[PDB]
């Protein structure tokens, strides 16, 4: 327990303590550097929220999508992870593919938007 | 720096008047123009007495019959209502230019 | 089976990062009512209690020689120092032609020829009248114009007199990472500054780090645990200093016995110069004291650790500095406001082959001070009335190896002042800053509705 | 009233030196200046030198430069003029006297930081009081 | 009717005009070191606003003015009848009663919400 | 069965402290008046205030614990310094002066109050100096020992007020940031403390002129109905009583001397404004106020002081109990001239249950505002004669003595603190913090 | 193919509606210059949260395309629906509704206020 | 039938004005050195800015109501003044000078253009003075009535430009912040106002060098196809007529004197760099420009001026009308030395339907840059021989005469206003703010 107190737990156990780490993501020698430090917290915090908005995951801590998992991204089975791994240890393996996965999410949900809007009128 | 005086000798009678002249080497335009000129009168066996300083002021105890004027490289002194005691030698001393010096001297005697 | 991407927000993953850490001082310190150059008053107050979380199963890589917390502390300390001297008196009018003579009243043989008795013409509060004044200056502050002297700084730059209303005593300050970042603390007892740290923790602010400015001898610092640690960037080099950290502190007393008086000279409207009046009593030398028994063992502990790097059968020597300017060839500090320059040639001596005594270290004094190795930014330290004495304990050294080749039988280490950021690198060797990266993606058996 | 006292006459051989002594009433030399003049039978007055009342200045004519030096004791209670290199023509009577001077600012140069630069020029106003007069002669 | 103008009306009538206040919690100004006074004011408003919005999110109430939850209302907090809480009492009056327990409620809500994400994840897995 | 439900945007608030920003109309900005109370810094104000009355609400105010006064104090001082930052420092004015009395036409009352001083002075060229003269008031030169000096030279050098700038007060509105609110109490008999039955809320306060004065509050806001007496602890002799008249007493101020301005160049691009010579006769500067309207006002003040001290008490007035000039006198500013009028003729009466009264006034130019030391200012002399008329909308009083429980109360004028001039304007306002979250029980549970 | 930031400014309103995610993503992020930084940075946040603030009280939080209950009006626009989405562009369109934007934003507030109250009312069946 | 559908992200913009921020090439100028318009503190520019061309979108530009010009002016000035803040202030140099003519191997053209002055000044020790001498150009000194003074002493004390900071115009890129965009006009024949059919959007503007000059635009961007005449109202005489060239015109300018620099110590850590002495012959500065190249360029300018003033009109160029040197001569900077060339040899012709022209040039060291008063700067002398090979790319003209009858228009160079110098670079840019909220009807409805 605590802020980042699950960094060495299994990835499955670390997923049950997301809130404690989300709450801590925001809030003249030492006077003007304050405004630089204060604002950078907001600009970084809004970056994460915006992505969760386009992806359709706004207002949630665990969110599911329609994107299938390309096996080439990581061949590890569903047991090795969530039971014998950690988020840092998981992060170090998906580094290359992260930038493209964010695009598949951003496109697979704009498909949902038009599809949803059409149904409301078609039906 | 040099100084000269004229006349060299002056035979005068009581009740008469006489005039003296003095010269300054430089036309130094400073210190009120007339600048610092000193006159003295001497007789044998007696220390000289100041007559005029600053070229226009009367020394203490000097009768009003003595006056002086001048500027630049030339200076002048005047005497009037002469009496017997006025005999002696008159010196003009330049107090502006360092080193300072006396004048050649102008003698006055009974006539 | 199949799997779909799942988005988790708030995951515990971080990456190294560099940012601007903000200060945090004890709230009670403000009640002292007197400001200090470190501007603890403008610094944020500290939290009532420390919050630290232990992290199991986690290993992290640290590096004290590429930590950026030191480079920020160096700029903050320089920036704070300058801001405190901006509003204080500027001693330009003191760059005049002095006339000096030696003082010889109750002069000790050692101290003869160090203090001058100088007299000069100075302006008074009125811009017309002038006053004839005198003041005592140490020999290191004046030079002869080639009986007639001048201040040493005049041909370089003017100096701002230190305000007598601001102090130089260190006040501990904590560095706190703002939101979105964190500070990782290596809790290993035998950490040598680089590589894995088996034990780690996260804290909201660092421990209280006193910005003690000193040379050749790390005073009032933190002590190690269970051993003496030798920490060098590349131990087998000669241009890299060695930061020894002592296991057990060794005390060093120092004194400036002279019973000197202060004297105010008004040199303009509302601005005054604090000169030195005639001394009271004898004229002696300043000095520090070190117990020779504790220093004899404390080098006994240091030599044993050095045998683990350069050889088990090498002859370890020590020598008296390298030579140069007082700011590097002596142990410099300030005790009470007076800046000492102590000749530590007696501490580093004798060779290693494999109860009521003391070591007296003569010390000079100075008043025109260049602090941060900068050119043209001198300061003038006003004199302090009465004998000033300080007691502190050493907790480290900054050594340098001379690099002998083909004759490795002996290695000789000399003290070195190095850069001033090595002084604070010895307190931030446990800390590194990491940027939290909450967003993560992993596969699961879930999918969206409709 | 300010009054001066001098020493007695003396006679010396050529090449020697004479150091005259002069005194004043009320230590007026602490407030006014001192000047020196000599005169011989049938010869005009010859300005020799002077010393300021603050001691800042001591000037002499080129005629006696090097051949004369002037000094005074503590409190300006006594002043001496020493003539060295005596010659036959030096036989004359020397006088101790006090004169007034004008102190004027000759050149000014302002300073923000420090005492403003200044240059002061002395000018001879008057000779006030003469001394007894000392006779010095050079003979075989 | 204006901003904050329901302050004296009872919780029932005040809860019917929530939007007017919500639009005032942000952008309260028309838009040289003296100005840092005002600049820090703008940042302060943004810094507080994101805290209230985030706090709602971790309860599952993101994006709603009136949001229902599923954490039981402990009767100890106030046994007052709904016929009194919403009919003859005010928010300014109400906040005084539940000030003590507020910090505890904010934990229950975050505790219940974490279950919904877990509950939803497992259900979607069965597909 | 009930559950927790959350409402966002509820009307709830709590006391708080924050930074308020100034907003003024652009009338002074469009013509470039450049008042020291910088409207350039202040944001443009709204075309018309929007006030919302909060019915049925009760709020508890306290005019003495209000922090708006302590934030306005720092604002006013800071704006003062920023205006003096570029103005020329009069460091070369600290020389030895040589003054002689002026007697050309000086009337016996003012005989010896100003001096004619001359001094060396600097010039544009660094190798030359000029001899100049200037008239200095008696209070601004201390004999050094016919040689004087400016009184400030041993403490600090004064910056001469940039003659282009203006000291005339202009209204400045204090506005609340987002998420905060200002609540104005509208109860007429509100005594500055305790619950106020009627309340509203405003985005910005009403225009408040930062008038600097002493012993008399000028150009202020008038009360309504009756005269209001306010004190922090009215049974304490250490607390000043802040009266507020319901009708404005008019006071006329002037200095008949027709003094001339003279500019002296003291360096490259810098000038010093001397006082020249006065055309015509030299006489004393005074302040008038009707003796009839001032007599009735004290009659209305006394019947309110009775309620807090008794009906049978003999209410007596006195003049200031000695001290400094800046505190024993009604010191104000009008037209760039700093008056120090002697109010011993206003507070002299005993109440046991046309014509004018004239107040002699002094003038000085070395000024130490805000009770600071070492930060003087030099006010340039003004061309011609000065005149000005103003309200008198309140007093600052103080009691004295405790010989008896209640027999005779004497109230002297005060003004030892400059904040009280502004506590008499912000007593209606308090700053609050809005907390929009709120949780209450309702019959509603999340579906699914 | 790409039509980056603002790239679809001249495309038919239907084709410009297909690339919203590229405009919405560029509305955030991206000693004289010391205050040329903070004012721009703080302003960028203030204007962004203002649009999300409006978009949240309408019942559209996080949705790039959001259908509302408020009915349209023929007075606001008289032309058919085919012309709007195939014979006009967004820059051309807002010139027409510019006269009526403010009144529409008012109607959407109340339309949301009814839903949340009704949603709470419907959940009281237990 | 239809419902309101709200779209967030629509490409809609409106004209607005905000604060742009700088950005420099950074790595392109590695081993950077300090200079005005600091290269550091500017966000480094991306190696490949992304320009996007917008298909059949028509925007109405206006280069004379542009606000990027007004912000650049207040921005270039600010960077200039903040660089002089730490350098030496030459108050001690405002002293009486004694100057004599320079005749040591001097040409008749430069007979008396530079004096030789000696003056007194203090040294590092304040109680001792030194006698120093320096060479001053005759434009910098004024007689006092052999005694001269620097021309600025009765207006302000100049600051000596630091020698380590250069005046080289490093390019700058103006960037708009998040939520804004910058529209470039791609049309070849766009006359600065009215619709521009071809439009595009960029992150930052191209490299704009703040070259300060007069009546000749140096080192500027060329017209892509043709000489373009741009003015706000061509039929207005009181409006300067901007001209842009499609081909540069080389101008070789030099200072043929071998000046030496000398350091005089005036205080602790302060030095005033005097002009030691000239080694060799003394000849005037000058610029060259090919007679055949220029006479061709003026041919095109007339060929286009005719479009606005008719086929038959006779067009005569004439040299500047008059005024101060700062406005009536081609003033510029070349290597840190400030030149003022007499351009009467360029604008001299009458137009009906190898050899290099040499322009005499003067020099100054007391510079007033932005037409202000009291902010002079002292540019220290540069040792050696100066030379610049910039090429010309525009003109700033004016016209006169004609009232109900005219047959021959006369044009003269002019324009001392500096924002007209950068208006030639930003004429194809404007800043707009994106508005992502849009409401349009659709057949969909909300479920509940
Ligand atoms: C840590 O310090 C050690 C020395 O204490 C460094 O080893 C030195 O590395 C340099 C650079 O590679 C070597 O120089 C090279 O050596 C040979 C000479 O024939 C040749 O490759 C080059 O011409 C060059 O001179 C040097 O010999 C070597 N010294 C020793 C004693 O091995 C080491 O690289 C440092 N480590 C790091 C990470 O910096
Ligand atoms: C002072 O002492 C030094 C040696 O310390 C000596 O060289 C010098 O001559 C002495 N000066 C005086 C004035 O006694
Ligand atoms: C002011 O009003 C309060 C509240 O009614 C009361 O307690 C207090 O005594 C009154 N007195 C003064 C002097 O304000």
UniProtKB/TrEMBL annotation, chain C:
<comment type="function">
    <text>Envelope glycoprotein gp160: Oligomerizes in the host endoplasmic reticulum into predominantly trimers. In a second time, gp160 transits in the host Golgi, where glycosylation is completed. The precursor is then proteolytically cleaved in the trans-Golgi and thereby activated by cellular furin or furin-like proteases to produce gp120 and gp41.</text>
</comment>
<feature type="glycosylation site" description="N-linked (GlcNAc...) asparagine">
    <location>
        <position position="389"/>
    </location>
</feature>
<keyword id="KW-0812">Transmembrane</keyword>
<dbReference type="GO" id="GO:0019064">
    <property type="term" value="P:fusion of virus membrane with host plasma membrane"/>
</dbReference>
<feature type="glycosylation site" description="N-linked (GlcNAc...) asparagine">
    <location>
        <position position="57"/>
    </location>
</feature>
<dbReference type="GO" id="GO:0039654">
    <property type="term" value="P:fusion of virus membrane with host endosome membrane"/>
</dbReference>
<dbReference type="GO" id="GO:0055036">
    <property type="term" value="C:virion membrane"/>
</dbReference>
<feature type="disulfide bond">
    <location>
        <begin position="23"/>
        <end position="43"/>
    </location>
</feature>
<feature type="glycosylation site" description="N-linked (GlcNAc...) asparagine">
    <location>
        <position position="349"/>
    </location>
</feature>
<feature type="disulfide bond">
    <location>
        <begin position="342"/>
        <end position="363"/>
    </location>
</feature>
<dbReference type="GO" id="GO:0016020">
    <property type="term" value="C:membrane"/>
</dbReference>
<feature type="glycosylation site" description="N-linked (GlcNAc...) asparagine">
    <location>
        <position position="117"/>
    </location>
</feature>
<feature type="disulfide bond">
    <location>
        <begin position="254"/>
        <end position="335"/>
    </location>
</feature>
<keyword id="KW-0945">Host-virus interaction</keyword>
<dbReference type="GO" id="GO:0019062">
    <property type="term" value="P:virion attachment to host cell"/>
</dbReference>
Automatic annotation (TrEMBL), chain E:
<feature type="glycosylation site" description="N-linked (GlcNAc...) asparagine">
    <location>
        <position position="88"/>
    </location>
</feature>
<feature type="transmembrane region" description="Helical">
    <location>
        <begin position="1"/>
        <end position="16"/>
    </location>
</feature>
<feature type="region of interest" description="Fusion peptide">
    <location>
        <begin position="1"/>
        <end position="13"/>
    </location>
</feature>
<feature type="glycosylation site" description="N-linked (GlcNAc...) asparagine">
    <location>
        <position position="81"/>
    </location>
</feature>
<feature type="coiled-coil region">
    <location>
        <begin position="96"/>
        <end position="127"/>
    </location>
</feature>
<feature type="disulfide bond">
    <location>
        <begin position="61"/>
        <end position="67"/>
    </location>
</feature>
<feature type="domain" description="Retroviral envelope protein GP41-like">
    <location>
        <begin position="11"/>
        <end position="127"/>
    </location>
</feature>
<feature type="glycosylation site" description="N-linked (GlcNAc...) asparagine">
    <location>
        <position position="100"/>
    </location>
</feature>
<feature type="region of interest" description="Immunosuppression">
    <location>
        <begin position="37"/>
        <end position="55"/>
    </location>
</feature>
<feature type="glycosylation site" description="N-linked (GlcNAc...) asparagine">
    <location>
        <position position="74"/>
    </location>
</feature>
<protein>
    <recommendedName>
        <fullName>Transmembrane protein gp41</fullName>
    </recommendedName>
</protein>
TrEMBL record, chains F, H:
<dbReference type="GO" id="GO:0019082">
    <property type="term" value="P:viral protein processing"/>
</dbReference>
<keyword id="KW-1043">Host membrane</keyword>
<feature type="disulfide bond">
    <location>
        <begin position="253"/>
        <end position="334"/>
    </location>
</feature>
<dbReference type="GO" id="GO:1903908">
    <property type="term" value="P:positive regulation of plasma membrane raft polarization"/>
</dbReference>
<keyword id="KW-0472">Membrane</keyword>
<feature type="disulfide bond">
    <location>
        <begin position="287"/>
        <end position="341"/>
    </location>
</feature>
<feature type="glycosylation site" description="N-linked (GlcNAc...) asparagine">
    <location>
        <position position="101"/>
    </location>
</feature>
<feature type="glycosylation site" description="N-linked (GlcNAc...) asparagine">
    <location>
        <position position="246"/>
    </location>
</feature>
<keyword id="KW-0945">Host-virus interaction</keyword>
<keyword id="KW-1162">Viral penetration into host cytoplasm</keyword>
<keyword id="KW-0175">Coiled coil</keyword>
<feature type="domain" description="Human immunodeficiency virus 1 envelope glycoprotein Gp120">
    <location>
        <begin position="2"/>
        <end position="108"/>
    </location>
</feature>
<feature type="glycosylation site" description="N-linked (GlcNAc...) asparagine">
    <location>
        <position position="98"/>
    </location>
</feature>
<keyword id="KW-1160">Virus entry into host cell</keyword>
<feature type="glycosylation site" description="N-linked (GlcNAc...) asparagine">
    <location>
        <position position="387"/>
    </location>
</feature>
